[PDB]
Structure 1
Amino acid sequence: ATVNQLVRKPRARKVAKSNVPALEACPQKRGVCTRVYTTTPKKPNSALRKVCRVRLTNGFEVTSYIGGEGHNLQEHSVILIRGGRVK
């Protein structure tokens, strides 16, 4: 913290990354349904969370949670994702 050390080396402010990189700084991105299925969550909760494996515009293959209760989703379907993790 001596200023000579501060002269020889600047304060490296830490660089943070996105947790949602597949959108690549976009609000929403178009996607293609690849597999629609359910998934059991981790220990404190017990459900069958409806979820779909998605091929995106940029070739990314991601999973994205189906909100709500009940849907009409097929594979090979055009959807749109907004973000947000599921805990």
Structure 2
Amino acid sequence: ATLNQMHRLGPRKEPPKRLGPTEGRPQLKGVVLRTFIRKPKKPNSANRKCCRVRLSTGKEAVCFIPGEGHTLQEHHVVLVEGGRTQDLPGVKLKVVRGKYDCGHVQKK
């Protein structure tokens, strides 16, 4: 672009930073609604443990539960955090182990 064209337009317009599943917040608190299994998109093979939750904002999201074995059930309370599960498409939230009803993984 010419110097006249750079002057008439100025600095590049910056698209706004749209928020993610946590809505620009470190964590959210949600109530478990259902516990189910999700299948990782190929080339991976597993039965990943997930749960649906109703977040404090009022929306409902799918959250991956990390660790080997959880005791979560419906009506439990959990603290979710950000971070996508790479193989699980659409799962953009995770549960925090050791907060509210969710507990630390039982060591073997």
TM-score range normalised by the length of the shorter chain: 0.7 to 0.9
Task: Tell me the TM-score normalised to structure 2 length.
Answer: 0.72
Normalised to the residue count of structure 1, the TM-score between the two structures is 0.87
3-state DSSP class of the match of 2:6?
helix
Which runs of 4 or more aligned residues in structure 1 lie more than 4 Å from their structure 2 counterparts after TM superposition? none
Q: Which runs of 5+ in 1 are unaligned?
A: none
| % identical aligned pairs | 49
Partner Cα distance (1:13, 1:64) in 2: 35
Structure 2 gaps of 5+ residues are 87-108
Listed one character per residue, the Cα deviations across residues 26-83 of structure 1 (whole Å, up to 9, x for unaligned) are 1111011111110111011000000011110011111110000111000111101111
Report how many residues are paired. Answer: 86
Superposed CA RMSD in Å reads 1.6
Q: Return the alpha-carbon distance in structure 1 between the equivalents of residues 3 and 31 of structure 2.
A: 55
Relative contact order, CA 8 A, sep 6+: which one is greater? 1
